[PDB]
Amino acid sequence: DLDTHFTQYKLARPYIADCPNCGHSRCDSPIAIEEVRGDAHAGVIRIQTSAMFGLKTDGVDLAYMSFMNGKTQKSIKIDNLHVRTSAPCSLVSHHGYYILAQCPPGDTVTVGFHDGPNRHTCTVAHKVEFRPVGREKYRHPPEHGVELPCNRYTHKRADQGHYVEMHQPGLVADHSLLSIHSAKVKITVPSGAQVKYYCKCPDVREGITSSDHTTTCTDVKQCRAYLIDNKKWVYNSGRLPRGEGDTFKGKLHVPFVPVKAKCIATLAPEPLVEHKHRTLILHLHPDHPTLLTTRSLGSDANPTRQWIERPTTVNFTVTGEGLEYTWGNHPPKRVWAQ
Amino acid sequence: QVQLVESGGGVVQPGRSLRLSCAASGFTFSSHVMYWVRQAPGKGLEWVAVITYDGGNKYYADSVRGRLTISRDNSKNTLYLQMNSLRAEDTAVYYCASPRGDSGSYYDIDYFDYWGQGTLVTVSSASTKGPSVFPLAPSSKSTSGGTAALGCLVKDYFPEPVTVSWNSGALTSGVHTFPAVLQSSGLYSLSSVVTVPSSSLGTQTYICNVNHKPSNTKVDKKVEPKSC
Amino acid sequence: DIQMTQSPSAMSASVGDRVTITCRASQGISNYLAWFQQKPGKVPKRLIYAASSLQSGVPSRFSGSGSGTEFTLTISSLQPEDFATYYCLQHNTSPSPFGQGTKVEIKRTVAAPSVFIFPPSDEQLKSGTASVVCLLNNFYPREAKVQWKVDNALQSGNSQESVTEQDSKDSTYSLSSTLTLSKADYEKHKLYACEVTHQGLSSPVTKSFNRGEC
Amino acid sequence: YKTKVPSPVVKCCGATQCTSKPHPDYQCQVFTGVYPFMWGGAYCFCDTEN
Ligand SMILES: *[C@@H]1O[C@H](CO)[C@@H](O)[C@H](O)[C@H]1NC(C)=O
């Protein structure tokens, strides 16, 4: 059931990275987008955000979201999560780091809830193009028409087709830890943490400790506060500094792997044939740019393939050998002459 | 069974270098933090150094920083302590130790559960020298309440240890062999004494058997009352 | 750096006594501290970790308390195998210093030293050095003062002392003090005296000899 | 394909030589003089040794 995914649900931690277009400039958003994979057909997009969707801190849920503000995971009800493109999208499902959504064509993808007092959105430059499966360069999945073996991402989550790495988080910096006691700098730890003390003054440079204080140095701006939180693990993101140790294992299954489904494809209007002596006058009234392919059935193929968008009449020389033409997604047909 | 076995200890001159080794067995050495601790003769424990499972971080006491270097070879299950510019203050038993046999990258809270027997490093300019053995003769001045004291002074030897027995080990009651003192010459000296009935001094022979293995010196010294 | 201070440096206790050893860190170490017992000539053995977690297989009579800067080892009823040196260790930071160690010795009744003096041997005098030995035998407590006098002049810097470990049968100590002189300085003086002050002596005991007397 | 980039390693002071991993098209390179800001302020103050 839903709770049979403890590897990603329990162990993972919402990390924060460097969104390129966080609102006005590049801030450090908790929803730093990574690995946009718009490689499907019908226009479904898989986005690997830096936030962890679905699971409340308290084991598991789905109506909740876990994002990291500060040193703590301030989890909330997911409520107004936007997934934007040239036009706003409509999300399908969300599972931990990944969120599957269906978008219209565009050149930018932006993600963001709006926690209410603050927005915390993020975008990234990445073109998204949607080629419908078939011979007709349509734009949106139509109400009716024939069906073809498309490829897309399943809405299902309980799959293990592919895995991704997840190791110990790196040494996250936090300047807010370098407080002072009016005589010397005081370090602090919230709970179970093991911070690192470093300062510019000639002193103990290593400073690995729980709650403690500097030896001699006094200038806050002349020190470093590195934080260690190895209790949880994070995704191997390219915008986060590597931990100096071992690549901790644990294969997080990819929630939405591609599958070979069946999408509804458009159906071009039927051509109006008009026979002529050894000549096939073909009246065409396309609705959207559709491929037209014809080939002679004789010894010489004599291929002809050309996209047609504006309604036009084309003619072909149908010899006694015969001719074949495939208009749109219609099944191929054949013809004679006298 | 978990074992740690130190080796490479010995006598070294001041300013010279020495390399200690510690072979490990009965646990996954390449996964655990390793530590050196030393104990100077008759002093408390001193923490020397630590090295991570991968060797990527190394820490040292300020007393040894820049002179001692901790290293490891995970392929040989072996810990090393390279000691350079050795001083007389570095004279200690060096113990190889680890936490409980459970792993981490740059974290530990099980400090020091499994240890080796230790290896003695002696930093001295002194050469190997056999002891001179002198009698501590019983006298009226070494007699109290019908008990006489007699002994042997085992003087000017290097290195430690010497062993002293009395009457080839037949006399053990009332024997005190004192810990050796390091003299200003850099040579060791100790006394071994025994208390005996004053009435036995004329009838019983007392012989101290001194053995200094490092110099192959054996001395049997008869201790008699000084004839006036 | 952090420094660990143990109090007391030594203590005397009887079997069955409650022993309390205090350790103080110079800076806060939360609860990342451990306690170690070392017997004479042996490796240390860990008794407690995390300032209160009793080590697996260690007797339930051992217990630990404190946090931040002040910590304790409590032995509820001291057993004969518990007479040893006890160390605290902080393990919150590297370097991880031990305390100085607290020696727990067997308390016994006061015993006055039997004092003996040994002149230098004629064999040693042929080598050009004179060693005069003063023996303090089978005394308790360990605190004894030895003072060398040569022709009534107090000696300083020319003697070395050695003390045995506590005797396993009678719980006493023995001390050897060795006055070392050149043969030439030994031959200049006549009266050699060892004056001993100890709690078991109502007054200082002097043992002496004249050089060349029997 | 898919360009799987592992998390990059940063040392505050002193260089870090790379090793040729057996990964297909394993491209490794070192950068110097970077002063990465991240989260809580700056990461290091070795302005040349970073
Ligand atoms: C037929 O082919 C001729 C010659 O290419 C072309 O001019 C004409 O437009 C085509 N269609 C009709 C309806 O004649």
Side-chain angles (χ1 to χ4, degrees), chain A residues 28 35 37 70-71 164 167 171-175 198-200 222 224 226 235-238 240-242, chain D residues 1-13 26 37-46 50:
Chain A
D28 310 341
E35 290 286 341
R37 196 64 48 77
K71 292 177 286 301
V164 86
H167 55 89
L171 297 94
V172 40
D174 189 347
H175 185 87
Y198 197 113
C199 291
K200 194 172 171 71
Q222 298 191 8
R224 315 184 198 148
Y226 303 160
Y235 164 73
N236 181 18
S237 181
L240 206 151
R242 200 212 225 90
Chain D
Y1 48 71
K2 179 184 63 179
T3 308
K4 229 303 177 180
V5 275
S7 301
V9 54
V10 182
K11 295 205 76 172
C12 285
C13 318
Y26 179 80
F37 292 90
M38 171 184 175
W39 197 164
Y43 205 67
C44 314
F45 56 71
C46 283
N50 259 284

Short mmCIF file of all heavy atoms in Angstrom, two decimals, chain A residues 28 35 37 70-71 164 167 171-175 198-200 222 224 226 235-238 240-242, chain D residues 1-13 26 37-46 50:
data_model
loop_
_atom_site.label_atom_id
_atom_site.label_comp_id
_atom_site.label_asym_id
_atom_site.label_seq_id
_atom_site.Cartn_x
_atom_site.Cartn_y
_atom_site.Cartn_z
N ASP A 28 18.57 30.81 -2.52
CA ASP A 28 18.63 29.41 -2.14
C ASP A 28 17.21 28.96 -1.78
O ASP A 28 16.75 29.18 -0.66
CB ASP A 28 19.64 29.24 -1.00
CG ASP A 28 21.00 29.90 -1.27
OD1 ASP A 28 21.36 30.19 -2.43
OD2 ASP A 28 21.71 30.17 -0.28
N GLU A 35 16.66 18.35 -12.88
CA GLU A 35 16.38 17.23 -13.77
C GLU A 35 14.92 17.24 -14.25
O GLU A 35 14.12 16.36 -13.93
CB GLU A 35 16.73 15.90 -13.10
CG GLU A 35 18.21 15.67 -12.90
CD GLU A 35 18.92 15.33 -14.19
OE1 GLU A 35 18.24 14.92 -15.15
OE2 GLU A 35 20.16 15.48 -14.25
N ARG A 37 12.44 16.42 -16.95
CA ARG A 37 12.46 15.34 -17.94
C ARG A 37 11.17 15.38 -18.75
O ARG A 37 10.24 14.61 -18.51
CB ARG A 37 12.63 14.00 -17.26
CG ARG A 37 13.04 12.88 -18.19
CD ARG A 37 14.41 13.14 -18.79
NE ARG A 37 15.36 13.51 -17.75
CZ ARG A 37 15.92 12.65 -16.91
NH1 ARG A 37 15.65 11.36 -16.97
NH2 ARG A 37 16.77 13.10 -15.99
N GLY A 70 15.17 26.87 7.24
CA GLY A 70 16.10 26.84 8.33
C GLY A 70 16.73 25.47 8.49
O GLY A 70 16.93 24.73 7.52
N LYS A 71 17.10 25.14 9.72
CA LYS A 71 17.68 23.85 10.08
C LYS A 71 16.63 22.76 10.32
O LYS A 71 17.01 21.63 10.59
CB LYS A 71 18.57 24.03 11.31
CG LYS A 71 19.83 24.86 11.02
CD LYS A 71 20.64 25.07 12.31
CE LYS A 71 20.03 26.09 13.28
NZ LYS A 71 19.89 27.44 12.67
N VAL A 164 17.97 5.67 -7.84
CA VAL A 164 18.86 6.81 -7.76
C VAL A 164 19.62 6.75 -6.44
O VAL A 164 19.17 6.14 -5.46
CB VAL A 164 18.10 8.15 -7.90
CG1 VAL A 164 17.57 8.62 -6.56
CG2 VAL A 164 18.99 9.19 -8.54
N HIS A 167 23.10 9.50 -0.43
CA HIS A 167 24.20 9.33 0.55
C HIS A 167 24.16 10.42 1.63
O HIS A 167 23.27 11.30 1.55
CB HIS A 167 25.55 9.35 -0.18
CG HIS A 167 25.75 10.57 -1.02
ND1 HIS A 167 26.31 11.73 -0.52
CD2 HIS A 167 25.47 10.82 -2.30
CE1 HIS A 167 26.36 12.64 -1.49
NE2 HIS A 167 25.85 12.10 -2.58
N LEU A 171 28.58 19.07 4.66
CA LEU A 171 28.72 20.05 5.73
C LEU A 171 27.99 21.35 5.37
O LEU A 171 28.59 22.28 4.83
CB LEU A 171 30.21 20.31 5.98
CG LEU A 171 31.01 19.09 6.47
CD1 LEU A 171 31.67 18.32 5.32
CD2 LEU A 171 32.12 19.54 7.41
N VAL A 172 26.69 21.43 5.64
CA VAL A 172 25.89 22.64 5.42
C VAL A 172 26.42 23.77 6.29
O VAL A 172 26.63 23.59 7.48
CB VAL A 172 24.39 22.37 5.64
CG1 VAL A 172 24.10 21.45 6.83
CG2 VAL A 172 23.58 23.65 5.81
N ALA A 173 26.67 24.95 5.72
CA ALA A 173 27.06 26.11 6.50
C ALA A 173 25.85 26.81 7.12
O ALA A 173 24.79 26.90 6.50
CB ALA A 173 27.88 27.06 5.63
N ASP A 174 26.00 27.36 8.33
CA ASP A 174 24.96 28.18 8.95
C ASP A 174 25.56 29.30 9.81
O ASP A 174 25.90 29.12 10.98
CB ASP A 174 23.97 27.31 9.74
CG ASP A 174 22.75 28.11 10.22
OD1 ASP A 174 22.77 29.37 10.18
OD2 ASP A 174 21.77 27.50 10.71
N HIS A 175 25.65 30.50 9.24
CA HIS A 175 26.28 31.63 9.98
C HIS A 175 25.55 31.92 11.29
O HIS A 175 26.23 32.34 12.26
CB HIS A 175 26.34 32.87 9.08
CG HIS A 175 27.05 34.03 9.70
ND1 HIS A 175 28.42 34.19 9.60
CD2 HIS A 175 26.61 35.06 10.44
CE1 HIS A 175 28.77 35.29 10.25
NE2 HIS A 175 27.69 35.83 10.76
N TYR A 198 35.61 26.61 13.27
CA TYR A 198 36.78 27.10 12.56
C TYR A 198 36.84 28.63 12.69
O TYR A 198 35.83 29.29 12.48
CB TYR A 198 36.67 26.62 11.11
CG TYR A 198 37.94 26.68 10.30
CD1 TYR A 198 38.57 25.51 9.88
CD2 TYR A 198 38.48 27.93 9.94
CE1 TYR A 198 39.76 25.57 9.12
CE2 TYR A 198 39.67 28.00 9.21
CZ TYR A 198 40.32 26.82 8.80
OH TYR A 198 41.46 26.90 8.07
N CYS A 199 38.00 29.23 12.98
CA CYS A 199 38.16 30.70 13.04
C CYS A 199 39.54 31.13 12.52
O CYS A 199 40.50 30.36 12.50
CB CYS A 199 37.96 31.21 14.47
SG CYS A 199 36.27 31.10 15.11
N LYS A 200 39.62 32.38 12.07
CA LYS A 200 40.79 32.95 11.39
C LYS A 200 41.96 33.14 12.35
O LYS A 200 43.10 32.89 11.95
CB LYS A 200 40.40 34.28 10.72
CG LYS A 200 41.47 34.76 9.73
CD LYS A 200 40.98 35.98 8.93
CE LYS A 200 42.09 36.63 8.08
NZ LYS A 200 42.49 35.81 6.91
N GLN A 222 35.16 36.50 11.27
CA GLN A 222 36.41 35.75 11.14
C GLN A 222 36.25 34.29 11.55
O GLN A 222 37.22 33.65 11.94
CB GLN A 222 37.54 36.44 11.90
CG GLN A 222 37.86 37.84 11.37
CD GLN A 222 39.16 38.41 11.94
OE1 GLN A 222 39.93 37.77 12.63
NE2 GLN A 222 39.46 39.66 11.65
N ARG A 224 33.78 30.29 10.99
CA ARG A 224 32.89 29.41 10.23
C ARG A 224 32.13 28.49 11.17
O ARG A 224 32.71 27.91 12.08
CB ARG A 224 33.65 28.58 9.19
CG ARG A 224 34.65 29.42 8.40
CD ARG A 224 35.37 28.66 7.30
NE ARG A 224 36.60 29.36 6.87
CZ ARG A 224 37.71 28.79 6.43
NH1 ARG A 224 37.78 27.52 6.20
NH2 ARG A 224 38.76 29.50 6.16
N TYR A 226 30.05 25.21 10.54
CA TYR A 226 29.53 24.12 9.72
C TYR A 226 28.66 23.21 10.57
O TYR A 226 29.01 22.90 11.71
CB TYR A 226 30.63 23.32 9.05
CG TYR A 226 31.59 24.07 8.17
CD1 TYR A 226 32.83 23.48 7.88
CD2 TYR A 226 31.25 25.33 7.65
CE1 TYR A 226 33.76 24.17 7.10
CE2 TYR A 226 32.18 26.02 6.88
CZ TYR A 226 33.43 25.45 6.63
OH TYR A 226 34.35 26.15 5.94
N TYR A 235 19.38 13.49 -1.54
CA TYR A 235 19.67 13.10 -2.91
C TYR A 235 21.04 13.61 -3.35
O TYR A 235 21.52 14.65 -2.89
CB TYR A 235 18.58 13.62 -3.85
CG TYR A 235 18.95 13.60 -5.31
CD1 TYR A 235 19.02 12.41 -6.02
CD2 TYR A 235 19.23 14.78 -5.99
CE1 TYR A 235 19.36 12.40 -7.35
CE2 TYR A 235 19.57 14.77 -7.32
CZ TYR A 235 19.63 13.58 -8.00
OH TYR A 235 19.97 13.56 -9.33
N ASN A 236 21.66 12.87 -4.26
CA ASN A 236 22.96 13.24 -4.82
C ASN A 236 22.75 14.35 -5.85
O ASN A 236 22.79 14.14 -7.07
CB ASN A 236 23.64 12.03 -5.43
CG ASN A 236 25.00 12.36 -6.01
OD1 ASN A 236 25.60 13.38 -5.69
ND2 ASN A 236 25.50 11.48 -6.87
N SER A 237 22.53 15.56 -5.34
CA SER A 237 22.30 16.70 -6.22
C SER A 237 23.61 17.38 -6.59
O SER A 237 24.57 17.40 -5.82
CB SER A 237 21.36 17.70 -5.55
OG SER A 237 21.10 18.80 -6.42
N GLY A 238 23.63 17.93 -7.80
CA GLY A 238 24.80 18.62 -8.29
C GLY A 238 24.96 20.05 -7.83
O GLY A 238 25.92 20.72 -8.21
N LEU A 240 24.79 20.75 -4.42
CA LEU A 240 25.01 20.61 -2.99
C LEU A 240 26.41 20.07 -2.76
O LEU A 240 26.83 19.12 -3.44
CB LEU A 240 23.96 19.67 -2.38
CG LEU A 240 23.62 19.85 -0.90
CD1 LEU A 240 22.19 19.40 -0.65
CD2 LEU A 240 24.57 19.06 -0.02
N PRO A 241 27.20 20.63 -1.82
CA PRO A 241 28.58 20.21 -1.59
C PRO A 241 28.65 18.78 -1.06
O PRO A 241 27.95 18.43 -0.11
CB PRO A 241 29.17 21.20 -0.60
CG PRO A 241 27.94 21.70 0.16
CD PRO A 241 26.85 21.71 -0.91
N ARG A 242 29.50 17.95 -1.65
CA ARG A 242 29.68 16.54 -1.29
C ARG A 242 30.11 16.41 0.15
O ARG A 242 30.96 17.16 0.62
CB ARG A 242 30.75 15.89 -2.17
CG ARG A 242 30.64 14.35 -2.19
CD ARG A 242 32.00 13.67 -2.34
NE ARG A 242 32.00 12.59 -3.33
CZ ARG A 242 32.28 12.76 -4.60
NH1 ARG A 242 32.10 13.89 -5.22
NH2 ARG A 242 32.79 11.82 -5.32
N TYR D 1 20.80 10.20 -23.76
CA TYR D 1 21.61 9.98 -22.57
C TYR D 1 21.05 10.77 -21.39
O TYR D 1 19.97 11.35 -21.44
CB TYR D 1 23.06 10.36 -22.84
CG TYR D 1 23.21 11.70 -23.51
CD1 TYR D 1 22.97 12.88 -22.82
CD2 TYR D 1 23.61 11.79 -24.84
CE1 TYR D 1 23.11 14.10 -23.44
CE2 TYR D 1 23.76 13.01 -25.46
CZ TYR D 1 23.50 14.16 -24.75
OH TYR D 1 23.65 15.38 -25.37
N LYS D 2 21.82 10.79 -20.30
CA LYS D 2 21.47 11.57 -19.12
C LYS D 2 22.76 11.89 -18.39
O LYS D 2 23.52 10.98 -18.05
CB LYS D 2 20.52 10.81 -18.21
CG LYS D 2 20.14 11.58 -16.95
CD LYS D 2 19.28 10.74 -16.03
CE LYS D 2 20.02 9.51 -15.54
NZ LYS D 2 19.19 8.71 -14.61
N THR D 3 23.02 13.18 -18.16
CA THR D 3 24.27 13.62 -17.54
C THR D 3 24.09 13.61 -16.03
O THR D 3 23.71 14.60 -15.40
CB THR D 3 24.67 14.99 -18.06
OG1 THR D 3 24.68 14.97 -19.49
CG2 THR D 3 26.06 15.35 -17.57
N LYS D 4 24.38 12.46 -15.43
CA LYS D 4 24.30 12.30 -13.98
C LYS D 4 25.55 12.91 -13.36
O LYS D 4 26.65 12.37 -13.48
CB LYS D 4 24.17 10.83 -13.61
CG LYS D 4 23.06 10.54 -12.62
CD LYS D 4 23.23 11.33 -11.33
CE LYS D 4 22.07 11.10 -10.38
NZ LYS D 4 22.22 11.88 -9.12
N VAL D 5 25.39 14.05 -12.70
CA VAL D 5 26.49 14.76 -12.06
C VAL D 5 26.43 14.49 -10.56
O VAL D 5 25.45 14.88 -9.92
CB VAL D 5 26.44 16.27 -12.35
CG1 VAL D 5 27.12 16.57 -13.67
CG2 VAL D 5 25.00 16.76 -12.38
N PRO D 6 27.42 13.81 -9.99
CA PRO D 6 27.43 13.63 -8.53
C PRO D 6 27.72 14.95 -7.83
O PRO D 6 28.19 15.92 -8.43
CB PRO D 6 28.56 12.63 -8.31
CG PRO D 6 29.47 12.84 -9.46
CD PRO D 6 28.59 13.21 -10.63
N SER D 7 27.42 14.98 -6.54
CA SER D 7 27.58 16.20 -5.77
C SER D 7 29.04 16.62 -5.75
O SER D 7 29.92 15.81 -5.41
CB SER D 7 27.07 16.00 -4.34
OG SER D 7 25.70 15.62 -4.35
N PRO D 8 29.39 17.87 -6.09
CA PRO D 8 30.77 18.33 -6.18
C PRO D 8 31.40 18.52 -4.82
O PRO D 8 30.74 18.95 -3.88
CB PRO D 8 30.72 19.68 -6.88
CG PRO D 8 29.35 20.21 -6.46
CD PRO D 8 28.49 18.95 -6.46
N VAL D 9 32.70 18.28 -4.70
CA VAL D 9 33.41 18.38 -3.43
C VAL D 9 34.18 19.69 -3.36
O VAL D 9 34.82 20.11 -4.32
CB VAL D 9 34.29 17.14 -3.24
CG1 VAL D 9 35.23 16.89 -4.42
CG2 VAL D 9 35.10 17.21 -1.95
N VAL D 10 34.08 20.37 -2.21
CA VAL D 10 34.71 21.68 -1.97
C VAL D 10 35.59 21.62 -0.73
O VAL D 10 35.10 21.27 0.35
CB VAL D 10 33.65 22.77 -1.84
CG1 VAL D 10 34.28 24.15 -1.62
CG2 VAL D 10 32.76 22.85 -3.08
N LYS D 11 36.86 22.01 -0.84
CA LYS D 11 37.75 22.19 0.32
C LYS D 11 38.09 23.66 0.49
O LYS D 11 38.45 24.33 -0.47
CB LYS D 11 39.05 21.39 0.19
CG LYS D 11 38.78 19.88 0.21
CD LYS D 11 39.97 19.05 0.68
CE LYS D 11 40.13 19.14 2.20
NZ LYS D 11 41.15 18.20 2.71
N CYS D 12 38.00 24.14 1.73
CA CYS D 12 38.19 25.55 1.99
C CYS D 12 39.59 26.05 1.67
O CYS D 12 39.73 27.12 1.08
CB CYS D 12 37.85 25.87 3.43
SG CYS D 12 36.08 25.86 3.67
N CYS D 13 40.62 25.31 2.04
CA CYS D 13 41.99 25.74 1.82
C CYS D 13 42.81 24.56 1.32
O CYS D 13 42.71 23.46 1.86
CB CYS D 13 42.54 26.34 3.11
SG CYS D 13 41.39 27.42 4.04
N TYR D 26 33.92 9.76 -18.11
CA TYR D 26 34.12 10.39 -16.80
C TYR D 26 35.00 11.62 -16.94
O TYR D 26 36.23 11.50 -17.03
CB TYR D 26 34.73 9.40 -15.82
CG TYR D 26 34.98 9.98 -14.44
CD1 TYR D 26 33.95 10.10 -13.52
CD2 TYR D 26 36.25 10.39 -14.07
CE1 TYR D 26 34.18 10.63 -12.27
CE2 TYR D 26 36.49 10.92 -12.82
CZ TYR D 26 35.45 11.04 -11.92
OH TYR D 26 35.68 11.56 -10.67
N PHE D 37 29.20 31.37 -1.92
CA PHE D 37 28.16 31.65 -0.93
C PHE D 37 27.13 30.53 -0.97
O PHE D 37 26.84 29.99 -2.03
CB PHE D 37 27.48 32.99 -1.21
CG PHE D 37 28.39 34.17 -0.99
CD1 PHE D 37 29.17 34.67 -2.05
CD2 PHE D 37 28.47 34.77 0.28
CE1 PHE D 37 30.01 35.77 -1.84
CE2 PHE D 37 29.32 35.86 0.49
CZ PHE D 37 30.09 36.36 -0.57
N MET D 38 26.56 30.17 0.17
CA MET D 38 25.54 29.14 0.26
C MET D 38 24.81 29.25 1.59
O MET D 38 25.43 29.22 2.64
CB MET D 38 26.20 27.76 0.13
CG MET D 38 25.23 26.62 0.43
SD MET D 38 26.00 24.99 0.39
CE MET D 38 24.59 24.01 0.94
N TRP D 39 23.48 29.25 1.54
CA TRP D 39 22.60 29.15 2.69
C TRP D 39 22.95 30.22 3.72
O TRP D 39 22.73 31.40 3.48
CB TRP D 39 22.66 27.70 3.20
CG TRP D 39 21.59 27.19 4.11
CD1 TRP D 39 21.41 25.87 4.33
CD2 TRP D 39 20.77 27.87 5.11
NE1 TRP D 39 20.60 25.68 5.42
CE2 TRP D 39 20.24 26.88 5.99
CE3 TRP D 39 20.40 29.20 5.40
CZ2 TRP D 39 19.53 27.18 7.15
CZ3 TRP D 39 19.67 29.53 6.55
CH2 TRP D 39 19.26 28.53 7.44
N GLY D 40 23.52 29.84 4.86
CA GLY D 40 24.06 30.77 5.82
C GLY D 40 25.40 31.36 5.37
O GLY D 40 26.45 30.93 5.83
N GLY D 41 25.35 32.40 4.54
CA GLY D 41 26.50 33.24 4.22
C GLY D 41 27.58 32.54 3.39
O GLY D 41 27.29 31.71 2.52
N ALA D 42 28.84 32.92 3.60
CA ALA D 42 29.96 32.34 2.88
C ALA D 42 30.33 30.95 3.40
O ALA D 42 30.09 30.62 4.56
CB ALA D 42 31.16 33.28 2.99
N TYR D 43 30.97 30.14 2.56
CA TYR D 43 31.41 28.80 2.94
C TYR D 43 32.83 28.74 3.53
O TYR D 43 33.11 27.92 4.39
CB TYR D 43 31.30 27.91 1.72
CG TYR D 43 31.13 26.44 2.03
CD1 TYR D 43 29.94 26.02 2.63
CD2 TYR D 43 32.10 25.50 1.63
CE1 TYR D 43 29.71 24.66 2.86
CE2 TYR D 43 31.87 24.13 1.85
CZ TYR D 43 30.68 23.71 2.48
OH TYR D 43 30.46 22.40 2.72
N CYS D 44 33.74 29.62 3.09
CA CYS D 44 35.15 29.65 3.51
C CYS D 44 35.71 31.08 3.39
O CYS D 44 35.11 31.90 2.70
CB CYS D 44 35.98 28.75 2.59
SG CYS D 44 35.35 27.09 2.22
N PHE D 45 36.88 31.36 3.98
CA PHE D 45 37.57 32.65 3.82
C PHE D 45 38.99 32.59 3.24
O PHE D 45 39.65 33.62 3.10
CB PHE D 45 37.48 33.45 5.13
CG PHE D 45 38.01 32.76 6.36
CD1 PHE D 45 39.39 32.55 6.53
CD2 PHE D 45 37.12 32.44 7.40
CE1 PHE D 45 39.87 31.97 7.71
CE2 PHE D 45 37.61 31.86 8.59
CZ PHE D 45 38.98 31.61 8.73
N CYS D 46 39.48 31.41 2.86
CA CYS D 46 40.71 31.26 2.08
C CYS D 46 40.51 31.75 0.64
O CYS D 46 40.34 30.96 -0.30
CB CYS D 46 41.15 29.80 2.13
SG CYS D 46 41.95 29.34 3.68
N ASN D 50 40.90 28.49 -1.82
CA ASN D 50 39.66 27.77 -2.10
C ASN D 50 39.70 27.05 -3.44
O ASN D 50 40.03 27.63 -4.48
CB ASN D 50 38.47 28.73 -2.10
CG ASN D 50 37.66 28.71 -0.83
OD1 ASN D 50 36.88 27.82 -0.56
ND2 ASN D 50 37.78 29.77 -0.08
#
